[PDB]
Each structure stands twice: as C-alpha cells, then as structure tokens.
Write a protein that binds this DNA or RNA. Sequence first.
DNA 1: AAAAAAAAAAAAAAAAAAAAAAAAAAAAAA
DNA 2: TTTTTTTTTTTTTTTTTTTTTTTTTTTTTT
Lengths: 87, 536, 521, 520
Amino acid sequence: VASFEQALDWLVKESRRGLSIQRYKGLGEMNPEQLWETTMDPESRRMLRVTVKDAIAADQLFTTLMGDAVEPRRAFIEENALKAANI
Amino acid sequence: FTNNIPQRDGGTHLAGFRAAMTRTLNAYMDKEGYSKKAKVSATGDDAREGLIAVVSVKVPDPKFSSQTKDKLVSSEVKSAVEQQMNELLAEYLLENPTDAKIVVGKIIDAARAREAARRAREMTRRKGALDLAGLPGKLADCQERDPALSELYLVEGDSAGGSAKQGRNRKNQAILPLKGKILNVEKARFDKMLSSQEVATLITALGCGIGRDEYNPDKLRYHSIIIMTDADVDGSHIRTLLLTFFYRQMPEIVERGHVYIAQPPLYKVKKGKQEQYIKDDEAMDQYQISIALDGATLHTNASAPALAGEALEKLVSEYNATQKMINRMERRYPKAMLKELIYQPTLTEADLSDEQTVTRWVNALVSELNDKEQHGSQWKFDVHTNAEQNLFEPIVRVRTHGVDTDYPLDHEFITGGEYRRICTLGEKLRGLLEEDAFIERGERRQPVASFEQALDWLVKESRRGLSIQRYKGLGEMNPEQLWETTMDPESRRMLRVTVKDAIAADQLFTTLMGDAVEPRRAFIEENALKAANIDI
Amino acid sequence: LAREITPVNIEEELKSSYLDYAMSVIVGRALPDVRDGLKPVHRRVLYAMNVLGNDWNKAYKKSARVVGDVIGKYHPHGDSAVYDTIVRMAQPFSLRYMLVDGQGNFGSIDGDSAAAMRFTEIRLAKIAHELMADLEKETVDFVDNYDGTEKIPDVMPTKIPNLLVNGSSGIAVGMATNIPPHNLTEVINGCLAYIDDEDISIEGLMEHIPGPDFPTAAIINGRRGIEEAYRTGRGKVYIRARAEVEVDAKTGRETIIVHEIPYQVNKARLIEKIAELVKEKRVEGISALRDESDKDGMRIVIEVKRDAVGEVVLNNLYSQTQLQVSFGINMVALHHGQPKIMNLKDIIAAFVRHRREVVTRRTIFELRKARDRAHILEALAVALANIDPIIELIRHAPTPAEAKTALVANPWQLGNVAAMLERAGDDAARPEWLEPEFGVRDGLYYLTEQQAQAILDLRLQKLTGLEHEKLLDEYKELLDQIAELLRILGSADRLMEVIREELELVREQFGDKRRTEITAN
Amino acid sequence: AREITPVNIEEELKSSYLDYAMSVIVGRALPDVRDGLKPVHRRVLYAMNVLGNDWNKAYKKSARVVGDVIGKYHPHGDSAVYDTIVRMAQPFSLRYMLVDGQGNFGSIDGDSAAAMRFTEIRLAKIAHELMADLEKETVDFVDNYDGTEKIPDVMPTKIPNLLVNGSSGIAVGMATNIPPHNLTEVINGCLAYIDDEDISIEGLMEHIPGPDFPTAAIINGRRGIEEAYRTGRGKVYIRARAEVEVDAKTGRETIIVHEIPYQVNKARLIEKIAELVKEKRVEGISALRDESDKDGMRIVIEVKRDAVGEVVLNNLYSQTQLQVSFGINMVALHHGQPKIMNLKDIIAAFVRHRREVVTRRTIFELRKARDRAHILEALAVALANIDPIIELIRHAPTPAEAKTALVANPWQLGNVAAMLERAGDDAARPEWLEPEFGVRDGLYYLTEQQAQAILDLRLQKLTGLEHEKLLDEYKELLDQIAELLRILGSADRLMEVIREELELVREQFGDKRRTEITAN
DNA sequence: AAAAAAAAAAAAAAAAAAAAAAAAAAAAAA
DNA sequence: TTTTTTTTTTTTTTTTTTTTTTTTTTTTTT
C-alpha cells in the first residue's frame, strides 16, 4: 500500500468477501426460534422501561410532534436536521 | 379481389368496406335527420340489403390465410380502404341527393320491417346519474330505455369489467361484472340461491326472484344477455355454471333466444407489421401451418419447378393427421416403427400367405430402423407361423432401455384402417424427395433429405419473428382491442343458445352438473376413449 | 359465411366446455404424475427456483421474486395459489421430506397461517436437487410454456420416489387422489427388491414397506386397510393419537397427555371441539383442558375428574373427537398421461422404468459429448503436430475463410505424437454423424470445417509444451470414459448396477427413521 | 448488558419520530431535483432496465417486474410498487408516460386498474433517454439494503423530468406539489438559460408561459403562475372546457363539457352534479348524461327552457368541481435536503446535472479508448515480430514463463508499427501506466497485461486482413481520443455538446400544448 | 364571521372474504 | 333407524377494508 485509504479499502473489501446480511422486514421474516433467542427469552432479553422525567416537557413534545399544527413540527425537524449537520 | 385473385371468404378489405359503409350511412342519416323522422335506427345487414359491390385491391406483398387464397389476412389493407371509403362515399352522398334519398328510403323500409318482426315489449327504467332505480352499484348501465336494442354483457370480474366498460357503446352496452365462480344451482339448494353474486344477476335482469309465482320473463330489462367470460379453461367453467343457472332457473329466457355467448380471442400473434387474433389451440396450429407454408417452395430435384401450394397444404394436412394418430397409438406400438412404416412398401393380406415375402419385408423394416436409430434401442424381427389361418404374421422385437418387448403385427393391424391411412400417406410420399431436393423461403436455401427435415426447417423459419400474447382474461386486453374483437356489432362473432331437445338437455345437465359422481366420471372416461379412438 | 350470429345447442356447448375443463383440470392441475410424483405447479415452481439458482447452500431469496418469476414465465394462474403451494412445500408438518427450505413464518399445526409473500424467503432443500439431478443432460422432454417463449420440463429426472414418499392429495372433476407419505429407506428397499426380482409379490413389497409414515408421528390402528390399499389402490386406514393416562403418585387424580395428533389435524380446532363437547355435556369427566407445547414436544393436558375412570374418558375422546381419523387412501395418478387407479407394485415399476429411461438418455448424451470433444482434440493434436506450415498458410491467406479452405483441402501428416495417440480405440471413438470421407485415411488426417474453425480459434497460449501433454491426457481420459459409457449401453445388467448404486447412495444420504407405529388390531 | 434499562419517554419519542420523519422526507415522499424521480420510480425503472423491458422488445408480466423490484431493490412490500407502476403507465396522470402498459390501467371515469396478474409492462421510449449512458459510470451507485447489489443514486437524465411530469407527494414536515409542463417549452427555457445564465424569471416565463396538464383544460389566472415561478408557491385555478350549445330548431340549450380539470374524476363529478340537482342547490338542470364515445369526452347537461344556461354554467363552475384550485408547492430534494425552489433554480440544477453527466461520460470514454489503444499497440507489435514470439512461446514450458520471457525481452518496432506508434506520440498512453513501459529509444517494452493479451491472441488474427483491421481501429481510437480531450479541455465545447443533446431530445419528443392560459 | 370536521391526491404499514371439484366423517330432521 | 346438509383438504376463479402524512376545498354548525 501507499496510503491509509488504500489499506482501509482493501481491508473492507476483504471483510465483505464471505459476508451475507439478512435484513428482517418485520417479525414475520424471523423464525420463531430466532424470536425466542433475541427478544422473548428473559435470559437474553433487552427491554426498556418507558418513564416520564418531566410531565410538562413531555406534553410539549407530544403536542408539537403529534398535534394538528404542522409549523412547529416542521421547525422541530429542521432544527434537528441543522443540529445533526453541525457539531 | 387481390391482385386479380378472388377471395370467396372475404378478408380484411371486406371488413373495412363494411365498416366504412355503415359508418358513412349512419353519419349521413344522423346529419340529415332521416332517422329521427322515421324514429328507427339503422343497423348492419340493412345497409347491406340489396347491394352489389366489387372491391379490387393491389397489395405488393399480400398475405393470405391459406394457399387456397380465400381470405386476405393483411393488416395494412383495412385502414386504407376504411379511410378512402369514409372520405369518398361521404363526398358522393353530399354531391348526389336523389340517389342518396332513395337508398335511405330503402334502408328505412328495411329497418321498419325489422322492427315489425320483433315482439311486443315495454321501455324499462334505466340506471342513471339522477335516478338509480334500485339497481346494483357495479352495473354500468346503458342509455337505451327500450329493450330489444340494449344488451347486457356478463363478465368475470372488476378488472374485466373495467376493460369492457372503458371500451363499449354507452347507448346499448351494459356490463354487470360477477365475482369469479358462481353457485352450482344443480348441486345447491334453492335456499342457497340467496347469495350476493346470484342476486345481482336477478336484480339486473328483472325476471323477479325466479320463483314459480313471480318469475315473469316479459319484464326482462335486456333482450340480449351476453356471457362474455374469459377465453380459457376457467372461463369455460364459469360459462357452464352460468348456462346451468339460465337453463334451470329461467328456462323461458333460453327458449326465447335472449342468451348469447361471446368469443373473445385467447392469443394475439404478430410478425413484424402483421397482427392477428386467434381463438383456440387448433386455430393456433392452423396459423402456424399457414406461416410455415407462407412463401415456401419445395423442389423434388435440383432443377425442377416448385410444387403447388394447395397440393403441399394437402400433404402437410395428411401428414399432421397421421402424426396425431401415431401419437394416439403410442401405447400399442413404438412411434419409430409407425413412422418407419410410412416409407416402407405396403403389405397386403395376400402377402401374409407367403412366408419369404413377409420375412423380406420385416427384415428390410428392421434394417432401416437399426440404420437410422439414434438411441440405445436395438430392433430384431421374428415371424410366427399361424397354423389356423395359414398366415405368417411378422413380429418386431425391440430392446429399449434394457427392456425387451414384442409387437406382433396382427392380421387385424394390416386391415385396421390406421395402417391403411399410413399406407396412403406412404403412397403419396414414396418418391417426392430425390437426393438433391431442397426448399426455399426467399433467398434462404436448404437441401432436405426427408419430409420431416423440410417441415422442421419451415417451422423454425416461421417462428423467427413470431411473438405471441396470451390473454389471461379480458383485463389484459386493451379497451380498443376488446372493442374491435367482440363488442363491435360489425366485427362480432356470437352464438345463439338454443335447446335442440329438452329431454337430452335435462339428462346432460343432470349427469354433468348433478350431485352423483359416477355418471360424470363415466361420461368423461367415455368421451376420452372416443377422442383417443377416433381412427379405427 | 362468417355470420355475426349462429345457433349453438345448449347440449353441445355445455358438453364441449365442461369436457374441456374436466380434462384440463385432470391432466394439468389436480393429479400428480406417477414418475416424478409432482403436480405441474410443483414442477414449475421447482424449475423456476432451479433456473434462478436457489441452491440449498446459497442465500435465501424472497418469495415475491420466485412467485413473480413463476407467474411471469411458466405458470399463468395467479400469485396467491402459487405462494400457498410454496408454503405447503416449505412447512414440515405437511410433507414428509420438504422440497423447500423456509426462512420466516410458514404456519403451524396450531392453526396459525403463514406470513405474507413480502416477508418470507425460500430456498431449495437438498432433497430437491436430487429430485432434479442431470436435468441439463436432456434426460427428460422439454415443452413450451404458455407464450412459447420458454421451455419447461415435461417431467423431472427424479432419483427419489416422490409419489410414495411425500404422497399427494387433489380433487379433479371426475377423480380424486389421496396417497399417504412413506419412509424413504423402506421405499428404496422395496425398489431394490423389485430390481432384484421383478416378479415380486405384494407380500414381499409389504415386508419391505410395512405401511405409510406420516410427518407427524402417530399410531396406525389396523393393517387390513394398508393391505387393501397396497393390493388394490383403495382402503381406509385409522390413525390414532399417542395419548396416555398419567396417574399422580401423591394424589389419586389423573391426567391425559396427548403427545401427538393424527395427520392433517389442527390443534386449535381439536381443542375447540373438545371444549364444545365438554360444554354440551357430550363427554363427561373432563376437569380442564390446556396446551403445554413448550417447544420440546407437543403436550395437551386433559385433566380427569375424581369420579371418572380416565381410560373410559380417553376411549370416549377417541370415539367422538378428532383424536382418531380415517385416512381414505385413493391411489390415483397420471400414467401415460391418463388417470389410473394403481397399487404399490405399479408405482414401483413405473419409477424403475423412469430410472431406466433417465440413465439411458444420460449415457447417450454423455457419449455424444465425449465423442465430439475427442473429435476436437484430434484436430488440435494434428494441428499442433504441423503448427509451422499451418502458421505459414494462415499468414499467407488474406482472410480466415481462405485459411479454412486451405486447411480443409490440405491433408496433414500425424507426426509421432498424434500417430501414437490415435492407436488405441481408433474404432468406437469417432462421432457417429461423421462421414468416412474425413478422419484418418492411411495416415493422412483429413479435417472438417468445424475442426478447421477450432484450429483457427487456437490461441498462442496453448502452443507451450505442457498444454500438448494436457491435450493428450484429456484424450486418453475421454477414451476411457467413452469405453465405460459404451459398456453401460451394451449390457442391460450394468444399467441395473448403475441404478442400484444410485438408489443405495440416495438411501445413504437421505435415510431417515420411521416416525409412526403400525400397531396390530 | 442489563436485561431492563430505563429510558425517558421524551428521548424515545423524539428519536423514533425523527428517524421516521427524516426517512420519509429523504426516501419516499419528495423527489430529487436532478432526475425528478422518487426512489420508487428510480428503482422500478432500474429493475425494468436490468430485466431488459425495452420499448421495442415484447411486454413482460407486471407480476415479474414487481417481484423483481421487491426481491432485489425495494424492501417495502408489493401492492404499492404496482400502484406506482400503474400511475406511471396511465396517460391521464403523467404528461409523458414512463411505462408502456397493456391491459386495463384505469380511466378518468374512476375504474381501478386490473390486478397484478393481468397487466403487462414495458418501458416507454422516453424512459430510455431518461436513463441514457447509465452504463458509462455517469452517476454514483448506492448499495442495496442487503448489500448484495447496487442501485443508482440518481439517473443520468436528458429530460427535465421534474418540470415535465411534475410531482405530488406528502412528507412528514413538508409536502410537494409541482405541475407538469410542456417538454418543448421547458427545453427552450433550458437552452435560453444556457445562452444567458443570468436570465431573469421574465425570460423563462416568455419561454415557459405555464403548466401543461395531461388533461387539456383552461387556466384562468397568470399571477398565480408568476408567484409560483418567482417564490415557488402559488395558487392556480383550472377551468373545464364547457360550451353552451343552443339548438337551432328550438331555444333549449345544453351544456357540453369537452374537457375536465386535472386530477378530477368524472364519476364523482357527475355524482356531485346529481346531488346538487336532487338537493336543489343548482337550478335549471333538466337532464344529465355521459356520452364519452371514445372520441374525447362529452358530458351533456340539458338546460330547462326557463333558464338562461350561462347562469347555470357559471353556477356549476362556482359550486361544482369544474373549477379546482391547484396549489403549487415546489419542494424537492437539493443536495439531499428539502428546499422550496423556483423555476430558475430547477433549470440551473438540471444544467449542472447535465454538465456532470457529460464530463463523467467523457472521462470514462477517454479511459476506455486509451486502454484499448494500449492493447492494440501490444497486438501490432506482436504481429510485427510474430516469428521470434512464436519461437519463445513454443520453447517455454508454461504460460507464466512465456509471459516472463515476453516482458523481459524488449521488442523491435516493425515498419508498420514504427509508422503507427510515432504518429500518435503522447495523449494516448493511459495515465496509470509508468514511464518505464511503452516505446523507449525505438524499442517497445511490454507490460504484464500486454503479454497476457499477446498470449491470448488467436491464430485467426495472423491473417492479412486483421492487421488492417487493427490499424484502422487504432487510427479511429486516436481520433476519438483527440475529440474527447477537446471536449474535456474547453468549457464552451461542453455546452455545445449539451445543447446538441437537448436539441435532439426536443426534436424526438416534441409535443404541442394541451392546456390554454387566459387573462381572466 | 368563525371553528370544527370530512374528503382526496400519493407512497407506506396492516390485514378480510365468496364460490368449484371429490371423498368421508359429524349432526341434526324425518 | 334412515335422508339431508355441513365441515375439512388443495388447486383454481374472483373481489374487499383500516390507518399515517400535508394542503386545499366544501359542509355544517354555532
């Protein structure tokens, strides 16, 4: 090699030689045993408890993202896009 | 005529002539208002009544249905004839008023006679934008209020319904799409007739609720009920179910002749510019043979003229019939033996008396079978001396796939009729191909050693530019294609359903469509045997 | 006359339409072929998967793509039915040996339906590849599709007796077939016994094949039905569930544990029926009812009351609910393209005849291929022997056609290497269609147009020393292969040896244990 | 690695809804400004192109195309891909159809298209020019959802598809609604922009007076069009073509609707007229019929004798859906972000896209020509010295040893090769090639690829004619390389090529106006 | 005047049913 | 103790419906 780009590209290209990805387009594409192994068995489960840190902030977020008015939703989405674009 | 060759069966030019004449006369009648004064609409076969015409055409590369040249299937000719007629006949009608008025008088007299031929009836309330009249939501009704001018098309579903609704005449055509297969009324109880699909047909026809004390066929809302199902097997089955419904529940409608059957095409076949619609598999086979013999010449010698087209058609027809028979006889004897018996000399019953002649004949047959063999089978002969009749029946052994079997050619097989037909085709084809024989399809040249090679080469060359479109129901046909084929009254080809014998019809309906399975199985098996055993 | 309207009789139209429909259904969707044991839908689905390349050792493909390929090309009868056929082929409680490997939800015996076409993915099973072995070697006849733009096989060159093994079930118009599954090892043993002695009795075939073997293990109650079915093609067989009566040690109560259920019986519908019988007081003594199928078996608990024998309750459940069902065998299949009621020996004989035909066609194709390659190798060896004047002729020629004419016109000396090569097997190693004008004639080799074209297509890479010896070794190997193929074609015993070796290999690879128990009664 | 981990409802809701919003906005809802297509249309066209659904080839069943799209490219399930295909096929939706379907594809009357198993699908002729030079790496290819294949990121279009066919889609935050336009006028606007890049919106209005809907109709105003083409948002009123026909024999009048507004169903229109008549919300209507005789459309509305008819027509315009307000909202993706944009922005984006496509195509063709010229130099030098090369190849034991010998030996230039090679000089060697190889002091130094090509040389090519074939091919490649370098060097020649392509596109797919713009 | 509610345009997620065609077992009418 | 109608296969033919999302209009209701 002569550049870090060449080395990284060669490493990735050799990584993806024998690779095979199966994307699941919903739980109907998973076998029941695969569902049991991943996210039904309490031993190997990974869940999340929904909790409310602040009632007022939660209400404001729900009303903005899910209310009838579109302008606050558009402003929120644009602000998050700009935040993602920036550091 | 086409290039000064008559066409007994018409052709595309005839259809274009008919369409243009009808369109121009109807437009002239509508413009001048003669139809309104007479209060009658002219139709086909009235504008053609008492007519004489000669339609000569000169095509550079004509294409006919057969070498007999009775039909012209060239697609280019219809549009030109239609355009020229639609211009110039209208111009003629404008210039000459007196003769046009006389012809319109004749047409109006014919239309009045046709209306007088019809029976009494009453105008019926129709589904409309302002008023629905309590009719189904899927009915695409027409604008004609008088029956005997309207007509109902029964189709198979909403896709076929849309294809038919887009292409039709809103004045007359009405469409009532069904939902797939319907109840078998022969098997179903009368209480099961209360179903969504069958009640829709009962509401639209307005024959009341098909009861003893309510079924009044005089209140029929359309005097032409057209069963336009798909052009395939399940379409035929749904047609049979509909015929059961009409015969069993409304027999007076079938007797009066209001039930019709449409015949949409199953295939569309195209070769470059030309296109054509084909109904069924036998028609497809005939079309393939016609293309194969289209511009095809067969020379028996290197320097000899081409054979006649009609004679070559007769030879190919006899050959195909014999090949179908040989395929039917695949169980009894090997196909290779039966094919080889065509080219061998005939063997009569008198030859069976002599022994040496039979041995020579079967030895020659087996030697030719062994020479041309291209599989693992091995042929051997054996003659059995029948002491009862003082005969010598040959036997041909074959060891195919390691399995040995004997096929004795019995005394009945020689005079069995099948062997007679094989002998006749052989007598036609003993010496119609010398060593230097060849065929041409234009600039292409191909020496041929046997008739099979010539036929296969012609078929392969025919199928070069061929493209086939099988319509899996009317939803695959464009509305223009469905209109031009089997909705336009000019280019229509319908069948009137009639009852030849009530007793035979009842027995056939009960056997084929009843509950009992044994008569149905026996009927199917007997008809299969009759189809297999056409040739004695 | 080409009239717009013509009369048609109600009798003629009805007869023609219904006979057309009946024969079409009978020949083309309902019954299976006796040879490969597959319906046209299964045949077209497997052919589409094989053409796509859904190999057993490759990534899954979505069911939507395979169904679209089947509908667009081969099978014009709507996508939902084709997907249902694929679902039935994939699931293991339907077929004894699954022809499709599924990835997703394909339903269950609990009554759950399969996932939609857009979720699941499919792949051929390893058995399906041996069901289509040597398909490329023109071992079976190909027929046109509905358009005529493609070719579909008329029958699969199977190595497995799929009809007996996986069974079948269909409803034609006049006919209706119903054939139970069987164990592959027992069926192959019966086939080998038939090959050893073709005048074998149904008693011997039943010694090798005691009875059916459903994918769901169960108990077959009797044997008279099996004997009648295998000697006549029809007979009723009773299939019972593997129930028990557990007795608690601590307490006197009892429980009935249904370990297995009969074939084509839904667990949910059976439990609903038992609940209905308990509610309606049809069956007495049922304290409770649940399922405990914890993916380590299939447990259905039916608690017995204190005032109940339990075994009497179990007998009542066998009599009333669907824990015992009668399988009506009706061995109807297409033989020579017509329906026929056939017994066990007829099916085995048909399979062995099919194997004879397949192996003979394969050997003929391989022999023709080997002879053609030997012809080309003779041309290449003779050309490499005389490479210098060939190069001079090609250089002097203006165009390749003139080079072809010069090469064909000029006879060529063999040289030492080609003369030594073309000594063993000079006879029975030429292509059959080649006339005696060409080939070796008193030392001077004569080329054909095809050989001249092959010589002109020769590359400079093959002028090295090693490639000449490679061509010589390939020619010797082809001579040995041609000799072996001719030996197979000559002797009928060697054909049986090859077929028996193939059947033994199939039994070894895909052998399986019997699941059901054929108890006496 | 806890089994259970608490999460705030605010963070989960925000992350999930922002993922959905960004995914819809980028992928499915809005189109791309360059090629004017959504990912569904792009993947459908790419799948059809890969299958080979050429406009002159035979049709293929719609089920096959839908299954190919879903199985390979589009992970979002069937019965929406088929709906997009149906919309692209039917002519009353798109101004220029991208699909040429057969069967029942619906109608303005409101009939739904036939099911997936009935119809058949084929690319339109214009769809090929929408995908011209895709094979020449003119656009970036993005990976598949599984990573097993690749899809184009954008098509190398020649037609301004966004302005031509329009668009209509709804995102989470945004929503686009762009009308279709006439291809000749849009190409004239593009050529005017090329001639003068600092063109005002008034000039583009002169070239492009307004939208041109597939259903011919009348547009009342023009201030809405001007506002749309300045700001990217405006309201346009589309009127029906209705004429009050007075019978000559009697004074009764009938209103005949010749044409209907865009995206209006005839069945719902007639139903609403019937509802207004039954509720007596519109007076003067005597009868109502549809007489569309496959020669356009004809909705006859008989007026009563005690009614003006003009008043009835004005009431039908005001109340009924014979007038519809088309709200223009030109939102499209630009550099992978939504943006409201006016007419000049869209034209400039299209011209930048064509600049990029032509430059990438010329670079690819130059690389291909230089590689082929390299191989032809190798073959010519081999044919010049075929005798010692034959000797070396014969004496070598293996092909690898022959390659090493050929690379090691510097080869004399033949007289024909000497005249051939020195005339070309530089500007034909590939860029990647080192100065070590090639002609050096009248001796050709072969590479490994050249030696492999020589060993792959067939004895058929030693004939006299093939040497002349190689010479002619080499000279043609030198001319092509010169033309490609001339195109790449100058910026004016790039615009000359682009203008010639746009003029040819206007010539092939020229079409007349359908709708009418009026002053009222 | 004023607010609220319903519909429809186009890509997404989900699903629901009606009949033929044989055999063979329930489960009520008679 | 006997008719009759109902469920189940597995290939075929047919259709049907519910939400999200944003502008814009048309009802209707106060």
